[PDB]
Paper text:
Zinc is essential for virulence and survival and is acquired solely by the ABC transporter, AdcCB, and two Zn2+-specific cluster A-I SBPs, AdcA and AdcAII, in S. pneumoniae. Although both SBPs share this structural core, AdcA also has a C-terminal domain (residues 322 to 501; here termed AdcAC) that is structurally related to ZinT, a periplasmic protein from E. coli and Salmonella. The AdcAC domain is linked to the N-terminal cluster A-I domain of AdcA (residues 1 to 311, henceforth referred to as AdcAN) by an 11-amino-acid linking region. Collectively, our data show that the AdcAN domain is necessary and sufficient for Zn2+ acquisition, with the AdcAC domain and the His-rich loop aiding in Zn2+ recruitment during growth under Zn2+-restricted conditions.
The high-resolution crystal structure of wild-type, Zn2+-bound AdcA was determined at 1.58-Å resolution and revealed a two-domain organization with the AdcAN and AdcAC domains forming discrete globular regions, connected by an 11-amino-acid linker and each containing one Zn2+ ion. The AdcAN domain has a two-lobed organization, with the N- and C-terminal (α/β)4 lobes bisected by a cleft in which the metal binds. The binding site in AdcAN is comprised of three Nε2 atoms from His63, His140, and His204 and one Oε2 atom from Glu279. These four residues bind a single Zn2+ ion via 4-coordinate geometry, with bond distances of 1.98 to 2.08 Å. Electron density was not observed for 14 residues (120 to 133) of the His-rich loop, consistent with the predicted flexibility of this region. Intriguingly, the AdcAN domain was observed in a conformation that partially exposed the metal-binding site to bulk solvent, with the relative solvent accessibility of the metal-binding residues (His63 > His140 > His204 ≈ Glu279) remaining the same during the five independent MD simulations. The partial opening of the Zn2+-binding site of the AdcAN domain arises from the α7β6 loop having moved away from the binding site due to rigid-body rotational movements of α7 in a plane perpendicular to the helical hinge interlobe helix α5. In Zn2+-bound AdcA, interaction between the domains occurs between α12 and α15 of the AdcAC domain and α7 and the base portion of the His-rich loop (residues 109 to 117) of the AdcAN domain, with a buried surface area of ∼1,200 Å2. The most stable part of the interface involves the salt bridge between Lys368 and Asp213 and H-bonds formed by the side chain of Tyr365 with the backbone and side chain of Asp213 and the backbone of Leu212. Our structural and computational data reveal that the AdcAN domain and the AdcAC domain form a stable interaction, with the His-rich loop positioned at the interface between the two domains.
Residue numbers in the entry: 27 to 119, 134 to 501
The structure:
């Protein structure tokens, strides 16, 4: 009969139904009346998932209860699908990363593609149906992407204030700037103190709208207008669709069309950029802001382990999303320019480095050269930005060390601690010549990681 597919919340349900069509009965586990971020599965819910043919969830950074279920699910017959597939995430403002990729139409295409791919692998006899259904829905998503680009590319004012911070990927992919606001709910009146803070914030930044995940209550809208001097509207994160909206034919695409209209009320109006209510402090040791007194000698054992070059994962495309993000975050280089920059940086024929308390072993061409190393000191460099970094210096004790005679590690630390990754400068001339090297910095992560894991780790912090 039809596949019994259990999905978690609304966009996972919709995207899965679009791909599976009449091959499946697709169930929505989290009903519209429950906020998906707050959902916790009951024993009955877990049973329903365990007994399904296929279970689809969006991402462990959204359905934070899914990781604990997978250890047992992996032993049951149900085939699981993580909708985001190999999509890399950025940190949010428990879970490490912001899951809200489906509010970017171009990313929604990638989730639909991945659901197609996984269902096609899981049920090969239906692959032509999945592929056909997916392609037709992707056509509609492509038109949505075009509407987004056309409606946002000429934005005069790129920043928008949202009570639900679901729109950072939309912002990155279409040239806007999400400004999340805290301590607000569509159905609740703020405290006197919070309202005063909001009134000052609106005035300081000339904020025209506060956007909410659903319509603000009549009372809250009135209060924000008469006391805080700001209008309200809806930026719907498409996490829930009411039965009323379902029966009126609303869906992901129509919600996103409404979101575009709502955004443009802000983005097509002149005005100053809106600052976050509380400012960031990026001046940290790992970002290169530290005091001389905290810089300490280190031993080779901080770097002990087995380490793999990241260069093959640039070459094979695994890091293409990293360079896409960098371009969208800074605007300073294009994606291709960033990839070229990191090609020069990562290029090396040293595929692996094994490090002990006293030795380093360098693998080139499937053969290894191993030397004993002594610590020789450290060097604090200052960069254009005004931040600094510490190189920790080692020298091989073998006459035959060649290009590995001199070795310097950079790992964003300044004192004893186990490295999580490093950039390594090595040569056979002197330490001083390596201090001037700024273009090539072969980069290593633990051998126990996949390239995909390295790529996601690069975006963390
Ligand atoms: Cl780095
Ligand atoms: Zn959300
Ligand atoms: Zn680094």
């Amino acid at each position: 009969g039809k596949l019994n597919i259990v999905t978690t919340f609304y966009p996972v349900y919709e995207f899965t139904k679009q791909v599976a069509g009449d091959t499946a009965n697709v169930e929505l586990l989290i009903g519209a009346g429950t906020e998906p971020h707050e959902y916790e599965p009951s024993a009955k819910a877990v049973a329903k998932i365990q007994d399904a043919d296929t279970f689809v969830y969006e991402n462990e950074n959204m359905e934070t209860w899914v990781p604990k279920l997978l250890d047992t699910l992996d032993k049951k017959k149900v085939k699981t699908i993580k909708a985001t597939g190999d999509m890399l995430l950025l940190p949010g403002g428990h879970h490490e990363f912001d899951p809200h990729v489906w509010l970017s139409p171009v990313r929604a295409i990638k989730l639909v593609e991945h659901i197609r791919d996984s269902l096609s692998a899981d049920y090969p006899d239906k692959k032509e149906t999945f592929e056909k259904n997916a392609a037709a829905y992707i056509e509609k998503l492509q038109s949505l992407d075009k509407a987004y680009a056309e409606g946002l590319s000429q934005a005069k004012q790129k920043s928008f204030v949202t009570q639900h911070a679901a729109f950072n990927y939309l912002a990155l992919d279409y040239g806007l700037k999400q400004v999340a606001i805290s301590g607000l709910s569509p159905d609740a009146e703020p405290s006197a103190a919070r309202l005063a803070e909001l009134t000052e914030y609106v005035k300081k930044n000339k904020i025209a709208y506060i956007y909410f995940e659903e319509n603000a209550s009549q009372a809250l809208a009135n209060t924000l207008s008469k006391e805080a001097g700001v209008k309200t509207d809806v930026l719907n994160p498409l996490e829930s669709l009411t039965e009323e909206d379902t029966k009126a034919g609303e869906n992901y695409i129509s919600v996103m069309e409404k979101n575009l209209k709502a955004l443009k009320q802000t983005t097509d109006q002149e005005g100053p950029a809106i600052e976050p209510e509380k400012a960031e402090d990026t001046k940290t040791v790992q970002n290169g802001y530290f005091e001389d007194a905290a810089v300490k000698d280190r031993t080779l054992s901080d770097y002990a382990g087995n380490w793999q070059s990241v260069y093959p994962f640039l070459e094979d495309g695994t890091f293409d999303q990293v360079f896409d993000y960098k371009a969208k975050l800074t605007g300073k280089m294009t994606q291709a320019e960033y990839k070229a920059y990191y090609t020069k940086g990562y290029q090396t024929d040293v595929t692996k480095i094994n490090i002990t308390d006293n030795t380093m072993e360098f693998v080139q061409g499937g053969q290894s050269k191993k030397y004993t190393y002594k610590y020789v000191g450290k060097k604090i460099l200052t960069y254009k930005k005004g931040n600094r970094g510490v190189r920790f210096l080692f020298e091989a004790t073998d006459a035959d060390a060649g290009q590995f005679k001199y070795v310097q590690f950079s790992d964003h630390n300044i004192a004893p601690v186990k490295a999580e990754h490093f950039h390594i400068f090595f040569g056979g001339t002197s330490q001083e010549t390596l201090f001037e090297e700024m273009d090539n910095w072969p980069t290593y992560y633990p051998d126990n990681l996949s390239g995909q894991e390295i790529a996601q780790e690069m975006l963390a912090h």
